[PDB]
Amino acid sequence: AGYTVLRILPLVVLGVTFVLGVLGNGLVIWVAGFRMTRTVTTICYLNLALADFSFTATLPFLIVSMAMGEKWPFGWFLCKLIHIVVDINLFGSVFLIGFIALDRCICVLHPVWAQNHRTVSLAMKVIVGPWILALVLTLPVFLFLTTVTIPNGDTYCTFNFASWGGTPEERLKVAITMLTARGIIRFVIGFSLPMSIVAICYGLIAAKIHKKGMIKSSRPLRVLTAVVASFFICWFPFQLVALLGTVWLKEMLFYGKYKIIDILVNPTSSLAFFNSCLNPMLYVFVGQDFRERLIHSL
């Protein structure tokens, strides 16, 4: 009864994300990685661009799956590769955004320390830390994801714990609490740690600049709000639906209850994916040097 718009919307948003994201991230990777000089900021931006570009280009396959009602028209090898790439890039984007905020706060709040102990060598060594966190936190997917096939039906890509041995009820226990833990980690490491760091650091930067009276225009308090708000608006709906689901997983699977969460997950996912397209615009394009080098390069 008009819920068709609810199904069609995610597909449209993800497609806009695919075109804008591949063009935006691609320009960031070319302009920063190759044309411009390497500074701590350029390395952190290039890492954000690589993460978003990987997710953006692994998005078309998801667009097909969502359109076909969670049916995988692809084999086992693509399913493990795509759901590994999407999930080492989404954690990568959230973590890198937290790292970029910590870097800006260390540069503004403590200027002397950054001047005398921050350089490309330490930065390239410590940029590995967000990526290794993502790889450790995506091992549930390599160890426990597959394609189950439904007789008289196409296959569906879902976690299958059948191979872990025991009674069928034992399989039920391994599936439930473990999936519940995955949903919790997706909230505490995924949103709390990045949202707390981004807001606390950007807020402290705002406080320091005003105390010293260095705001001389609207840009200083426009970009800071744009970054904190972009992250909250893009991720709060998805994290909220995912957290509610993890808390109520038993009811949903066993008793088919709280059906609203299922319909909401694809629309709420669309905004989260959209953040990947917005990140190149609110973190690299705003800068004067990047725009100048791009205009010369074109």
């Binding site: 999407v86 989404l90 954690f91 879902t158 976690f159 999936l179 689901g245 997983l249 949903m252 996912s269």
Partner: peptide, 5 residues
Amino acid sequence: MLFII
């Protein structure tokens, strides 16, 4: 991150 349940 993807909810796959």
